């Protein structure tokens, strides 16, 4: 009765976000055609956070599907759990975005912001009492970062007090697809330092390292990586759909991490990520998760937490765990590690414990941490910006839709303030 609407934008966001709905649907027992076939009555008890009843005992998700090319939407309906979606909510264009931020925002998706919103504004009336949205995108491309940025300023000027959520891939330094990734990302942080109320940072480069060392996969395709983000993005909405013993909804976290109105770019994590060979050899308790929770190679952002200071840590646990044992382990990993936690915040950890675990795991956890390390992602972005910009490398396509040479420097100083506002509070 605290509903959330899913918006999924681009070719990375739709591949990520069509794997999220296969995680959730068999958490709640339902078939690949929305038929309920579950084996727990508490699977249905809060299904209406993400679903919407259809006549005959079939449930449809609340998702709006965004693209500028019509070829991806065929690739989602062809998927395993693709046919559960709403066919009136598939909305897309004709011609390409050119991998331009200047074409999702200005040409190709700006003739579509009447029709994405009419599907969107209908979905926020079928709810009982709305709480949130969630956009699913990256910061390297045109569709994901140029429509998913216009849409946020479409929602918040309509719904300025509902808490928005945002899941975002940050472009890696050395892992490269475009040559124009710094140009795409730096003009898109201009509208997420203002408009989101919750934003996440996930790097593809550190995603590979988990799959090499911890998971010890031989060659990871995307399907396991898009699965890795699905069990943390389904970690922040755990206290809405299942009973807790110390529970924190989507709103309770947001006022408690963020100390000042522009420090809201968080790091994910997942504690019991284990290799297949070492599951038989592993003890699973509440201490040993925490040595894996805070462990600096089991977190999905390529800037070392030992090269900064933590501000606040949440940890949304799942299982049946003792509540002294939760609250002394969040003391013990502060006292033995005193330097990397800031002063002038005495208890530097928030905690949360649920009661329904994941599928097959007897106990699990989920890390979210706000460190001062995230400036390193915000310095190698910013130096590669001025590396190309000081002789105007690839601009006359973005200048084709007519932005002058100040709007790339106006939105460059809005990107270097996060270098300032993190070293402002580091020492």
């Amino acid at each position: 009765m605290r509903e959330i609407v899913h918006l999924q934008a681009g070719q990375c966001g739709n591949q990520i976000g069509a794997k999220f709905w296969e995680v959730i649907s068999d958490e709640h027992g339902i078939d690949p055609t929305g038929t309920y076939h579950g084996d727990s009555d508490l699977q249905l008890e809060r299904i209406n956070v993400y679903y919407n009843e259809a006549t005959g005992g079939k449930y449809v998700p609340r998702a709006v599907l965004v693209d500028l090319e019509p070829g991806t939407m065929d690739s989602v309906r062809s998927g395993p759990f693709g046919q559960i979606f709403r066919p009136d909510n598939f909305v897309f264009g004709q011609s390409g975005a050119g991998n331009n931020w200047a074409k999702g925002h200005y040409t190709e998706g700006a003739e579509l912001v009447d029709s994405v919103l009419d599907v969107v504004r209908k979905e926020a009336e079928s709810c009982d009492c709305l709480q949130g949205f969630q956009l699913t995108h990256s910061l390297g491309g045109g569709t994901g970062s140029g429509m998913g940025t216009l849409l946020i300023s479409k929602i918040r000027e309509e719904y300025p007090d509902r808490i928005m959520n945002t899941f975002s891939v940050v472009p890696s330094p050395k892992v490269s697809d475009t040559v124009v990734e710094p140009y795409n990302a730096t003009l898109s942080v201009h509208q997420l330092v203002e408009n989101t109320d919750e934003t996440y940072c996930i790097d593809n480069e550190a995603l590979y390292d988990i799959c090499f060392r911890t998971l010890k996969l031989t060659t990871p395709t995307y399907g396991d990586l898009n699965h890795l983000v699905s069990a943390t993005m389904s970690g922040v909405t755990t206290c809405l759909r299942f009973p807790g013993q110390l529970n924190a909804d989507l709103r309770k976290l947001a006022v408690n991490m963020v100390p000042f109105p522009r420090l809201h770019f968080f790091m994910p994590g997942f504690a019991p990520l284990t290799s297949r060979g070492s599951q038989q050899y592993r003890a699973l308790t509440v201490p040993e998760l925490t040595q894996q929770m805070f462990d600096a190679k089991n977190m999905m952002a390529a800037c070392d937490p030992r090269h900064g200071r933590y501000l606040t840590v949440a940890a949304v646990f799942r299982g049946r765990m003792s509540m002294k044992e939760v609250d002394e382990q969040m003391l013990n990993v502060q006292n033995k590690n005193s330097s990397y936690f800031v002063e002038w915040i005495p208890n530097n950890v928030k905690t949360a414990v649920c009661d329904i675990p994941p599928r097959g795991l007897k106990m699990s956890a989920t890390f979210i941490g706000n460190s001062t390390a995230i400036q390193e992602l915000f310095k190698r972005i910013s130096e590669q910006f001025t590396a190309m910009f000081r002789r105007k490398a690839f601009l006359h396509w973005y200048t084709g839709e007519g932005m002058d040479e100040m709007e790339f420097t106006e939105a460059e100083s809005n990107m270097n303030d996060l270098v300032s506002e993190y070293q402002q509070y580091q020492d």
Partner: protein, 136 residues
Amino acid sequence: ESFDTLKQFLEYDRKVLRFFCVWDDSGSVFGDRRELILHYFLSDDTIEIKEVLPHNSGRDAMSLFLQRRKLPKYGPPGVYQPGQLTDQTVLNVYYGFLLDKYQLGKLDQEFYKDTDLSIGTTINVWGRKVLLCDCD
């Protein structure tokens, strides 16, 4: 599936089957044993049926009996809701339409065919039990 309407036309353009027919309704209060002609166009598998009239009966000189139509098999099928008789199902409207991968609202509507029509057998013309008694 094939929605192409050209190869059959090119093969079987001007070939029409004909069976003389009889419908024996004298069990009504004022009924007659009636004589009909059933045409069947092999270009598109649609049945047209005519009327053949005696010397001085009291019936009117109307043109036919039923129009050229794909005749349904058993009885009169119920009159469906609008928008349900589409041949190709559609995902969304971007007028331009994008086709759907699964056929959800497609209906199992059986029809008469040339192998369902034979000499010496009885069929159902919207409820009228007739017997195909002759051929050319």
